[PDB]
Write a protein that binds this DNA or RNA. Structure first.
Ligand SMILES: [Zn+2]
Lengths: 25, 67, 213, 136, 101
RNA sequence: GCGCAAGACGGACCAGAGCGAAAGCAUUUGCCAAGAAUGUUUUCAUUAAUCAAGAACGAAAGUCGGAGGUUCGAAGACGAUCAGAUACCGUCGUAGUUCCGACCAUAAACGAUGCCGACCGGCGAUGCGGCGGCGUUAUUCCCAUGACCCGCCGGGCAGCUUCCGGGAAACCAAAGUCUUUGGGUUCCGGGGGGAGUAUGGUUGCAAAGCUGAAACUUAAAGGAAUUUGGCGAAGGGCACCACC
RNA sequence: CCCAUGAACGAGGAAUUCCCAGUAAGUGCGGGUCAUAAGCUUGCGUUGAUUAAGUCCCUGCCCUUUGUACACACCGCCCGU
């Protein structure tokens, strides 16, 4: 695991949880 | 080809290194008898001294490496 | 089923009169089959020949183009269409540690023949020169290019096609350029790289007939 | 069929266009105009192997076939327009080009001017492949 | 660590050069970093030049040469054995090897 | 083989050469505007490289509105390869790659080394400007110009060597002038994970940039370099239990 | 030991072994084993050559340079659902 795909996975998780928070309200 | 070449005979003047994958052929410097101006490099299979002469079907093609 | 070389003619081509050897080769075309005419399909054929096969003994790596526009029977009479150069010579003169100068000029003759005089130039290192680079400034290149443009627009504008075609056969314009540009920066490899046909006038048979004598 | 010239002293001239890629070879023979071809044979027409289409053996077979066809026509001298694939890709000619030209010369046919007619670009478009390109 | 004083290139005060494409591969190697090859050779090689000489309508005709410039990626330049690896002390030789043949 | 149309790009000349604050910049010509360096017995006379707030520019990719879509080509379709491929390989192919305007401000944006100033070895080259001097050339005589050659000076990209000196060592004319520590001045780091994550603010059409922890867990994580080791890395040597 | 009996086998596929001068090979004779005993082994002697005075292609071994996140040493270390 290099830093590029770890950053990509953290970005995807943050985008998913931000979308869930903004559509939950 | 379709060309009839008379037989030309040539004399060795210096022995050189041995070519071939198994060390079977020998690069060698050989010069002609009818005209000693030009010298040609040929590949010869067999044990060659310095001083003897050679028999050539052609007098044109150059020698090369193992292949 | 039938072989297609039974209804085929044979023709001989000829070169114009500024060259030495009139006969240069042969061509072939099919017979007149119905509405099609064999002379109509024999016009658009560019003959790409060498100069040493056209003169007796002169520069071999210069090349010329010939286009067919005259046919009446068993003979094709051509005209100048373009002068080229061999790629091996052009790649041989190009080398590192020197400055290449290229100038193109659009110029017209007295008659309606529009030319395009491409030219090249390569610098020379002196016999006592210890340096390796031997380049030139950009304004020196601009001055050399301006001199080349005014030289090759001087020698084509005043005269017709029949004089500049004869002038292109020996090294005349290149020697004039090399002699004139010895003061700006001395360069040695100057030759006309390419001449391209651009515009041709309305076809006249009398001038073409008086071309060959 | 035949030509009107004398067949004793002088000889006739044509041009042979030799394409040499890395998977095919061409021996295309046309007249001095370059417009009217007489016979075209390719190295893939002589071998039943897709990998052996570009080789000296297929080149020699095609050269002997076109030499026989030109001898029945009566074309006795040729100028070589040798070219590779050209373009944006590589410029080195194929390995069968030298053997094709040698086998064309060995049939007893005259050889004149030799020049390289590879269509080199000034600067063409983007080549095939990514930034990392073709790798294995 | 830093293996070389430079970085396998000829860029000192530029920061950017135009990229080129490899001949075998299609790598977008920078121009100053790639191994550039300039070889000269005849149109047909020496296995047939005598047969070409005895097939011509000319007399003592000179065979023309062929000019081409090759751009090699460094992986392709080592895989095709154009350039090899050296020792630490032998790396400080900017001169080319002598061309005896 | 002949011409026609469209779009893209400027090879060979092309270099450890140049310019620019940095990204970056290679066909010819013309117009506008700016700038380093050299030269000066001109001019102002302390007007200064340093910088939180703030401000301009900023590779590619990404979003929005117009005609263009040549080549190449994310996603997608197909065929081989493999025990297993919606990977390497090959054929097509949308969005993009191309222009004009509206955005974001992130790169191994790296010389992985802030800026100004003083000092501290030698040598050979290259680019610019100036200066001095036998000789050759633009044909033969005389001057100035360009070219070549021999030097000197100033700025700049760079190169070779070492007991100046320094460093943990790779190495360095700066990474030197440092316990014999002090020329001036911005940003920034205190074991390794958690983590550039959560929350709050701010910017943005969107994607997302800036500021940025804690709980908990561990005794290691890392840098330089010598010997056998192991290569689907290269170069050699030997052997009739290897070959010819 | 004596007399009858008279099969396969017509110079051998893929593959493979040994050997540079008194050598391979065709032959015989001693010793060990042995109460009776050599198609085995070790020695001795007779006749006695063809080819080669080289190579790293194959089969192995040795060494130099380079790279290393390995040192239980690649049968190693180590990433993720
Ligand atoms: Zn490549």
């Amino acid at each position: 695991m290099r830093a590029k795909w770890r950053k990509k996975r953290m970005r995807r998780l943050k985008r998913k949880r931000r979308k869930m928070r903004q559509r939950s309200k | 080809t379709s060309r009839v070449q008379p037989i030309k005979l040539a004399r060795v003047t210096k022995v050189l290194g041995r070519t071939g994958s198994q060390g079977q052929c020998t690069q060698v410097r050989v010069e002609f008898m009818d005209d000693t101006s030009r010298s040609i490099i040929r590949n010869v299979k067999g044990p060659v001294r310095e001083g003897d002469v050679l028999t050539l079907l052609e007098s044109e093609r150059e020698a090369r490496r193992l292949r | 089923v039938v072989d297609p070389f039974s209804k085929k003619d044979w023709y001989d081509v000829k070169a114009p009169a500024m060259f030495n050897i009139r006969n240069i080769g042969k061509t072939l075309v099919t017979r007149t089959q119905g509405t099609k005419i064999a002379s109509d399909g024999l016009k658009g054929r560019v003959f790409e020949v060498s100069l040493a096969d056209l003169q007796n003994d002169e520069v071999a790596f210069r090349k010329f183009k010939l286009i067919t526009e005259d046919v009446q029977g068993k003979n094709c009479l051509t005209n100048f269409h373009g002068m080229d150069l061999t790629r091996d010579k052009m790649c041989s003169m190009v080398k590192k540690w020197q400055t290449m100068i290229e100038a193109h000029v659009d110029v017209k003759t007295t008659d309606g023949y529009l030319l395009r005089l491409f030219c090249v130039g390569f610098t020379k290192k002196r016999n006592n020169q210890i340096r390796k680079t031997s380049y030139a400034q950009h304004q020196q290149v601009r001055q050399i290019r301006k001199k080349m443009m005014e030289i090759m627009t001087r020698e084509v504008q005043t005269n017709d096609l029949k004089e500049v075609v004869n002038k292109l056969i020996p090294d005349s314009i290149g020697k004039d350029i090399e002699k004139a540009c010895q003061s700006i920066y001395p360069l040695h490899d100057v030759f006309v790289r390419k001449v391209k046909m651009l515009k041709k006038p309305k076809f006249e048979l009398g001038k073409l007939m008086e071309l060959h004598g | 069929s035949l030509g009107p010239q004398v067949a004793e002293g002088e000889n006739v001239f044509g041009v042979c266009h030799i394409f040499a890629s890395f998977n095919d070879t061409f021996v295309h023979v046309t007249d001095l105009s370059g417009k009217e071809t007489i016979c075209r044979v390719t190295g893939g027409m002589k071998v039943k192997a897709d990998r052996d289409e570009s080789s000296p053996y297929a080149a020699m077979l095609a050269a002997q076939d076109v030499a026989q066809r030109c001898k029945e026509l009566g074309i006795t001298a040729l100028h070589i327009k040798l070219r590779a694939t050209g373009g944006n890709r590589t410029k080195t000619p194929g390995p069968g080009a030298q053997s094709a030209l040698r086998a064309l010369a060995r049939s007893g046919m005259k050889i004149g001017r030799i020049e390289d007619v590879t269509p080199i670009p000034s600067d063409s478009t983007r080549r095939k492949g990514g930034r990392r390109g073709r790798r294995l | 660590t830093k293996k070389r004083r430079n970085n396998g290139r000829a860029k000192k005060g530029r920061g950017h050069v135009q990229p080129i494409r490899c001949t075998n591969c299609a790598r977008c190697v920078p121009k100053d970093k790639a191994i550039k090859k300039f070889v000269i050779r005849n149109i047909v090689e020496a296995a047939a030049v005598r047969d070409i000489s005895e097939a011509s309508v000319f007399d003592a005709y000179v065979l023309p040469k062929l000019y081409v410039k090759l751009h090699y990626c460094v992986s392709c330049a080592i895989h095709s054995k154009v350039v090899r690896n050296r020792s630490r002390e032998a790396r400080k030789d900017r001169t080319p090897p002598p061309r005896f043949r």
